[PDB]
Amino acid sequence: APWDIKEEEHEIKMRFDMPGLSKEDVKISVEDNVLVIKGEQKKEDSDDSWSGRSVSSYGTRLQLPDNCEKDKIKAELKNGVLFITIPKTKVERKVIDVQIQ
Amino acid sequence: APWDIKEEEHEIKMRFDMPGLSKEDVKISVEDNVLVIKGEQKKEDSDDSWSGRSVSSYGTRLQLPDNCEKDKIKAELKNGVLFITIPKTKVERKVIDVQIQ
Amino acid sequence: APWDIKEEEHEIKMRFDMPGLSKEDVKISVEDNVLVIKGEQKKEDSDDSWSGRSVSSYGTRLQLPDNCEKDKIKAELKNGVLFITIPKTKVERKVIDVQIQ
Amino acid sequence: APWDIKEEEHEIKMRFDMPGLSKEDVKISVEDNVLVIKGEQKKEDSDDSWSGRSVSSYGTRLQLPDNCEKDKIKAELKNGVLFITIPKTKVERKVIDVQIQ
Amino acid sequence: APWDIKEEEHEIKMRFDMPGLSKEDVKISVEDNVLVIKGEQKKEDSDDSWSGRSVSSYGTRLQLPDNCEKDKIKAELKNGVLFITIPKTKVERKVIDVQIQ
Amino acid sequence: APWDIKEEEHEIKMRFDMPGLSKEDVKISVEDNVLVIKGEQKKEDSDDSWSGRSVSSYGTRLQLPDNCEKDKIKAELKNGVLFITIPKTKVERKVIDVQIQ
Amino acid sequence: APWDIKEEEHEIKMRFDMPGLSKEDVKISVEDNVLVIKGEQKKEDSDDSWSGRSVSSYGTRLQLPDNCEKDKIKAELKNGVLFITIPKTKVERKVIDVQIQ
Amino acid sequence: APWDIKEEEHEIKMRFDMPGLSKEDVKISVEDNVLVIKGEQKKEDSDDSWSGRSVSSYGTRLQLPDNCEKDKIKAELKNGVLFITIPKTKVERKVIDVQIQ
Amino acid sequence: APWDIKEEEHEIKMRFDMPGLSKEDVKISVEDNVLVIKGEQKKEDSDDSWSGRSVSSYGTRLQLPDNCEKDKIKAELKNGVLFITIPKTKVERKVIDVQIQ
Amino acid sequence: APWDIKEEEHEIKMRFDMPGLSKEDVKISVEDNVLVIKGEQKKEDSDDSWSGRSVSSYGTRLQLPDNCEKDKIKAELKNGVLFITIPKTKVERKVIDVQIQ
Amino acid sequence: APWDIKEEEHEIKMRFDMPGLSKEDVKISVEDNVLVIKGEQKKEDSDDSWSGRSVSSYGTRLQLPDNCEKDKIKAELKNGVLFITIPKTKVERKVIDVQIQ
Amino acid sequence: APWDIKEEEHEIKMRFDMPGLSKEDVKISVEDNVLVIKGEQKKEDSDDSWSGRSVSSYGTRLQLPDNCEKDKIKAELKNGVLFITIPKTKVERKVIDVQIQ
């Protein structure tokens, strides 16, 4: 299965995966509320000696409900699998319901 | 015809419809600018004694141009038909046009 | 789910549904063994002031196995939902089975 | 090719095209951050004397990243071709990167 | 609408259209009875500085019923719209009808 | 790109890839000339706490031209990527060509 | 248009059509309530001397609501067009309507 | 070929077929004019010890032109093949033909 | 079958067909080498009193190899079937064959 | 369900089925390792007197992993159902596993 | 690739191909301006002793711009490949261009 | 028709075909039991002077039941048609049949 993206019990979480890609070719970037991921192909630093070299596009968008709180943002890569944990927001301070009468 | 959603001559109006659903299983919820509707199936409180019991999903999104003014928001249900009337906003205080020269 | 039509434990039952349609625009008609339903659009008696006025065709056929016994035929409309209960018949007074030898 | 829409080396640019439409039937309109274009068919002011008169819908949306700065907004029409040049914004004053550890 | 081609009340008329193309890149050619149009892309004489440069094929055939009378043949280009007016012929000097008996 | 399978300049090589799968859930098996791969889902040994858990089938066939020489067979897993290197055979000791005359 | 079949103001009427078929190759047949038409190809009695001889199937079913009254049944063929006029029945001697309460 | 259903030279005949089904799991049932067949799966009385156990639905409808004469109705099963022979009726005591004039 | 168009053993022949159309609404027209047929709908001269009135387009083109010799051109309509017989031409006065060497 | 083909707990088993076909029209044939089945249509030895006579092709291939041991091969036909039981082989006398290091 | 048909630097050229067909079964025919090719199947003069005998249709049309000059027309067949070289014409003695003003 | 491949009355035979390809660009190759054909495009040795030059892939596999006996293998090319005749094998020295009891 390619990816997961969901509000967990307390936060927001993404998870994707990529063969070959090690701890080197990974980058991200933040904005006022926009996250972006940039993975690329460093499958040119050992040797080719091959045919089925894999090359594709990896960077991708994201927007958080509230402006992305930056400090506690965590992420990790293992066995060709990246995943990013990020804090939830504090929505629902006020609401009103039906008066259908 | 399932629904209508439109800016009338003075306000914003939604209208949808649902068999069975009476004045009980209806709920809404507001946000800073987000409306959401939650209807569900209380077709379990009289008796089944049936085969063609109808059950589906009814809640749905909405966003208003300007933050939803809450007081005068009205809505009503009759003959299995929901409809919500909500105040318009006061856009277009300034504009500029072509200077194609 | 649109409709149900079935032999229950003791009788025959139809059930359908229609938004808007109240206790006024409903009619039926019987025959020697043919039932027919005629619903129509009285969505012209309050006001239009609208775009998504719903108008369609509602009348529909039926035939009962035995000629429709007329007295105890019942029906009802609620929350835009029609349903007709009608007596079963007394088939299977005699039968013969295989003699495949 | 119908249109182009892109961030150039320094600004934002749209370009589209329309047969017949001259410097008369063109209009635009601005908002806090919303641009809209309104072209229409003045192919009724010379004469018809024709069959293949062209009539369609031309107005279209746009939103700029930052609220549309209004003064230096330029545009032009030639040979049935419209194009609008508009100032870029000043995003990316701060950023944070991975700490995948 | 792309083009029109028709016998008018007195003559024959074509009309087509092309963004960008001005009074320069247009050419035609005549034959004993064959007309041909050759438009091309001079969208290389101002500057590119662009992505959505439009380039396509424009030349096209035609045959007139009678050999094309050459003198009074007229044509014009405006707002990226070409159109050619050409004299009709003098067919139907004799006819015979049914004798189905 | 999913996989590569090819005769290299001197040997035979397979390469595939699998997210999540680490150095644990991997197995192979040999035969007289048949290779088979068995990967499975050990995504049950850390915790679920998730929705998009990935589970599928991974084992797959192979046959080598000549009976698989077993000693020098190598393979490796990194960044969720498996690949197996295996010795080539020594075909083409004799041949005959056309005599089409 | 191939055919017409309808209850007129007072009776029941069919109309169809067939090239070539003259007053010879036409037949019908009645039943307790079933009508059937049998037209065939007598395009073998003058001469072939041809390629595009037309041959197809023409007979077709019908059932009348009440058993077909036989005497006044009329029909006619002209210009390769058949049409059958037949008496209506006397349905609706009794009816009952809604009691939806 | 699955089945045959036809009026023979003197009667009416059905024939179908079913693997496994022996002389046990077969049943029929008659009505005023309705025949029905009920075969089922007794592939649970010897043992499973298997994977490709076959289970499906076998009962099926029939209506005879005239009310089914019951005595001489015959049927048989052999080599997983059922077939039912039933008496024809005595239709066509009277008829009327065209008067197309 | 709709139509036939063919060179017979000695001439050229067309044949088509049209329900309703009698000996009245038929017309043709000749040219230097162009034949055209014009049938239309006179299904307005008796009465409508109907629903399935048939109306369509019937005129159609033709070109003969050599200019249409006019005198001996024959045609006829019967049972809603038109057919036109026309003289062949006298092609093939000279020819040359391969010299492939 | 048409057929089953599988390695059971101890052997190899096929099972298929055929209406009509009795113990007569069945044949098989063996090879070094190839099995083939030949059923045909002896539905010509009793009488036709029918329309829905069934005729098709029944012979089919098979290959066993190891050369087919011939003695204990069993098979049977009942209720139009064929099935062949055949001995398994003795594979897996030696194996080697990963050394992914 | 099946065929080529093109105006070369000085003439007109066709080229096609056909297995089996030798220098015998080839024919052409000329007209005032129409060329036609007739190849056929003489794959009946040696012996069949075969299954995959090839038989198809080979004759085909052509029209030249100007009436086909007959003398210098050349053609040849080799290795199951035919090709015809034919003289070009002398078009474009006069022309007129745009006056779009 | 592209090819034929079949066991004749005494041997095995292939036949295919290729335009242009003469007695030069043809090659085959044998193995223990594998035949392979290699045709290629020598349509570069006379001249191009063309557009519709044909180039494709021609080599193809084959396996014989028994190891290919090499001496008497024959083949030939004529009129762009290849065909290979090869000796049959001597299968069926022993067999066993049903004992369905």
Numbering used by the authors:
A (entry chain 11), B (entry chain 8), C (entry chain 12), D (entry chain 5), E (entry chain 10), F (entry chain 7), ...: 127 to 227
Reproduce, without paraphrasing, sentences from the article in which this PDB structure was first reported.
Small heat shock proteins (sHsps) represent a class of highly conserved molecular chaperones that prevent irreversible unfolding or aggregation of proteins under stress conditions to maintain protein homeostasis. In this work, we study Hsp21, a chloroplast-localized sHsp in all photosynthesizing plants that plays a critical role in chloroplast development, fruit maturation, thermomemory regulation and protection of the photosynthetic complex during heat stress. DXPS catalyzes the first and rate-limiting step of the methylerythritol 4-phosphate (MEP) pathway responsible for the synthesis of metabolic precursors for isoprenoids in plants. Here we show the formation of a stable complex between Arabidopsis thaliana plastid sHsp, Hsp21, and its natural substrate 1-deoxy-D-xylulose 5-phosphate synthase (DXPS) under heat stress, and report cryo-electron microscopy structures of Hsp21, DXPS and Hsp21-DXPS complex at near-atomic resolution.
